[PDB]
Point group: D2
Chain length 199, copies 4
Amino acid sequence: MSSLSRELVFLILQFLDEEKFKETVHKLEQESGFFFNMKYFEEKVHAGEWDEVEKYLSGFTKVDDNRYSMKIFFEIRKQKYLEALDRHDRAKAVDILVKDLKVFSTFNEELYKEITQLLTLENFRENEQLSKYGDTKSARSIMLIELKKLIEANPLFREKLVFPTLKASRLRTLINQSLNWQHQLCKNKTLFTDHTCTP
Amino acid sequence: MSSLSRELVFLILQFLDEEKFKETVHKLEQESGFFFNMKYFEEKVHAGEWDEVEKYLSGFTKVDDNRYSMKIFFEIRKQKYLEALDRHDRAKAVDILVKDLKVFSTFNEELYKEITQLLTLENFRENEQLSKYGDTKSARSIMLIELKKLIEANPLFREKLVFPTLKASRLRTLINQSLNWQHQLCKNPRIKTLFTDHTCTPP
Amino acid sequence: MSSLSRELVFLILQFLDEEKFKETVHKLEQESGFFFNMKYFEEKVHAGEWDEVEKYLSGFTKVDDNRYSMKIFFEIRKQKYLEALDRHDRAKAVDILVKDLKVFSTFNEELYKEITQLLTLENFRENEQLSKYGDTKSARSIMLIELKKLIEANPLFREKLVFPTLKASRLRTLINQSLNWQHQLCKNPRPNPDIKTLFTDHTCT
Amino acid sequence: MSSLSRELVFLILQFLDEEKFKETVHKLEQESGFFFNMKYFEEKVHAGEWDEVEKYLSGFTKVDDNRYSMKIFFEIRKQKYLEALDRHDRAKAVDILVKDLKVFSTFNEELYKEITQLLTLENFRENEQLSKYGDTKSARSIMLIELKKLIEANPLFREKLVFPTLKASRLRTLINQSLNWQHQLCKNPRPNPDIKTLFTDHTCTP
């Protein structure tokens, strides 16, 4: 995965963006892990698509890579848990608590217990530290701000947050150059095979 | 698109496959609609990932484009329904029957009533036409045999099932050719970027 | 022990009703099977307590005793099913459909398929025959009017729908009579006297 | 002296028992509150009929009457909760915890937190205090032994656990007496006559 190879991906990213292949752009972002699209991450957070959010994140970091990463996954999963409590889906809330939040219990036993106990409140805002929680829309925006600091501060996201300035259609431009080089033999088609000039 | 632009997408598909960016490959297949990957389709069907199956499918066709597509979406949704019955999740079975299969009742009302009536059997295999139904993996495979024919017969799919023959790393090959072009005129020479054209150091 | 035994149960019913042991009254009605309380039945139906409704009915009749009984159970279970559909509890609706309504498919196969099909409707009123249904309260009332006629027509309830006219506390009156006999039987009837227990006959000397 | 009534109720209990009207017997026990049937209570606990158990108990006591009662109800609802965890129905387990067990949190907040935390274990037997818990059948049996003790110590059940010893069919005998007091009052009866009803006194043909 050399620097030239990695730069080819950015060129592909640009090309995909120009053809309006949106999902492909973000899958490529995620699977290559070369560029974290902060703007895309925001949209998905506001939309509360938490599965997509974590899946995208996993292209860049794991929960225990460092404490910035672990604080990021925690805030996401905490918000997910609270939203379930707020719609009174207790069953889903319990599922989130065992499947997503337990990994954090080893690191703070008392915090996990306190999180667990919110299940038995009729409204979780009765808890002092959550008392100022607004509605769903309000909580996501607030948490999004905290997610950004964590990401921007995170060592693993350092040089992945700004897309290089490029001239439009750069990949296409490189392809024209390669086509001209096949005509270098100039005695006067396709991209799949080299052009063969008739002599 | 463009006729050459379209070939560039295939080169990108090949590049992505070699870098092992698998999900990207199939999203690109789906969003471009240029190549239907039958092998990928088979895995997702055996795996019963029905949302992914339909999502991938939607890059190539809509449910009511032609009767081959109709049959494809109907067989998938029927199997999904039977599986819900087989795991005794009747709420889920009814949900599927209303949300996924109801669109088909217009075209055959009696078929829809009969599928609905499977809800009240203690085992749907008591029904004659399902009497040879196996388990989940056998039903998926047998249904898969049927989906492949429908796809192969489907006008919207038949020129999309064969990937063009290529030497490995063709995009990379082209990129090196393009690097040879920028350095073509450079006497007095003396590792480069792809973002901007290279400038020859003068004497 | 036969006809008096049946009359003693009615006296217990009156005694229990006077002591306000209400659940006990209706358990006795149900288990003896001697008196069907239409009024209590109406309350349970209006309240939608279908498990109790069927439980109480089952003390008097079974689903296949005759066509009047079968039709009573069918209307009850039908209404019960529709209510599950109306609150969009689909699991419960299918469960009612499989456990309770399947017994009727034998006697009418096409009807059962049509009831099954209500599951795929966005609202059961899309079915022509159910289209004029009002709210749940209204549907229970309308159904109750028909059930009432079915019970009144059903031979198996003959003699079970009218409570005998009685003087209040008739069981108590009898016990005092039995106590007056326990003194007569006894020596020269010294008063008052205090009466000791009902468990054993009273002694004198 | 509603002292004889309380005895008439017992005669009816006996009469109902002899007629095999079983459900009627226990409703009378429950609604009168005069006799707590421990044998029946045991059967309902072993079968896990928890709604019937609480429904029956409630004829004799409420959850907050005294500390034995509150504890009886706590043991029942705890076991009910654990069984829900053991069948992996967590939606039900949380449901039991909020509706049934929360009333006890006031009195021991820390205990309630510990019980709540059982939700996040793979198995509640991982908890030190539950580690010797067997299956549903043994657990009910163990807890039943404790419930029997608690009921026996509870002042509200004090004079209610022993059925008076009676001659069989006592109510019938009394009715026959109420009947012998009938053909007597006139009197011209040679054969004991056909007795008409219990609903009205018999008529003496003078």
